[PDB]
């Protein structure tokens, strides 16, 4: 969006970008939580199969 010299577009775009920044941060934390849960799943599976053998 062109913002050259045009206030109400300059800052408006800037606010959208800020909201995007926060959103990306939250998304990263969420996907990291999912990764952690899968890591526990894998560790359990490895431990369980040895028990089975």
């Amino acid at each position: 969006t062109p913002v050259e010299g045009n206030n109400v577009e300059k800052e408006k775009a800037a606010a959208a970008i800020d909201k995007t920044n926060r959103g990306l941060k939250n998304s990263l934390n969420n996907v990291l939580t999912v990764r952690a849960e899968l890591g526990t799943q894998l560790s359990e599976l490895s431990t369980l199969d040895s028990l089975g053998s």
Binding site: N29, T33, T47, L51
Partner: protein
């Protein structure tokens, strides 16, 4: 007669060993699991953790 007594206790020992070994296996794994839960507790003591982590 004496031989009969001896044979019966042979069988009894067989089944006792069955159960005893089967317990020991999962018991060792229980020790393992307690210890890992312990380690991750000690990490809960980490005084730098953020609420999401």
């Amino acid at each position: 007669q004496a031989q009969a007594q001896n044979s019966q206790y042979a069988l009894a020992r067989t089944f006792a060993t069955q159960k005893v070994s089967l317990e020991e296996s999962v018991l060792s794994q229980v020790t393992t699991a307690i210890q890992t839960a312990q380690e991750k507790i000690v990490y809960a003591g980490n005084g730098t953790l953020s609420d999401d982590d």
